C-alpha cells in the first residue's frame, strides 16, 4: 500500500530538470542579449546634451 | 510608467535640449564682432572733426 502513496506523493511534488533546462538555456541568452543592449547604451550616451 | 511620464515634465527649464544650445552661444561672439566694427566707424565719424 505504501508504494502507491510514495509513488503518487513523488509524482505530485517533483519536477523534470530537462524542461527547466530549456527555459534555463532560453533565459540565459535573453539575459545575455540584455547586456549587449546595455553595452549599446554606451554609444547612446553621446547624444543627451549635445 | 507613472515615474517615467511625470519625470518628463521638465518643471523649470531643464537640460536635455537646453544643453545643446550652449555650444551655439559662441555665435553671438560673432554678433559682438560687428558691434566693435561699429565703434571702428566712430573713427570715421570724428575723423571728420579732425
CB contacts < 8 A (A, B)? 9
Phi-psi region of B13 (alpha: psi -120 to 50; beta: other; left: phi over 0): beta
List the grid coordinates of A19.
524542461
User: Whole-angstrom Cα distance, residue A12 to residue A6?
Assistant: 10
Alpha carbon distance A24, B6 (integer Å): 37
Return the sign of the alpha-carbon dihedral for residues A43, A48, A49, B3: negative
**CA atoms in the 13 A half-sphere facing the CB of A31:** 6
CB contact under 8 A, A48 and B16: yes
SS (H, E, C) chain A: CHHHHHHHHHHHHCCCHHHHHHHHHHHHHHHHHHHHHHHHHHHHCCCCCC
Chain B residue with the nearest C-alpha to that of A48: B16
Solving technique:
cryo-EM
Check if the beta carbon of residue A49 is closer than 8 Å to that of residue B16: yes
φ, ψ for residue B17 (rounded to 5)? -90, -35
How many Å apart are CA A8 and CA B10, to the nearest integer? 62
- What does the DSSP assignment read for B1-50? -HHHHHHTT--SS-STTHHHHHHHTHHHHHHHHHHHHHHHHHHHHHHTT-
Amino acid at each position: 500500500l505504501s508504494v502507491n502513496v510514495q509513488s503518487i506523493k513523488s509524482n505530485v511534488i517533483d519536477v523534470d530538470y530537462g524542461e527547466a533546462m530549456m527555459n534555463l538555456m532560453q533565459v540565459q541568452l535573453a539575459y545575455q542579449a540584455s547586456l549587449k543592449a546595455s553595452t549599446t547604451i554606451s554609444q547612446l550616451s553621446l547624444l543627451n546634451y549635445m | 510608467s507613472v515615474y517615467s511620464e511625470y519625470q518628463s515634465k521638465s518643471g523649470v527649464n531643464t537640460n536635455e535640449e537646453l544643453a545643446a544650445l550652449i555650444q551655439y552661444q559662441s555665435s553671438y561672439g560673432a554678433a559682438a564682432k560687428i558691434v566693435s566694427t561699429v565703434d571702428q566707424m566712430l573713427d570715421t565719424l570724428l575723423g571728420l572733426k579732425s
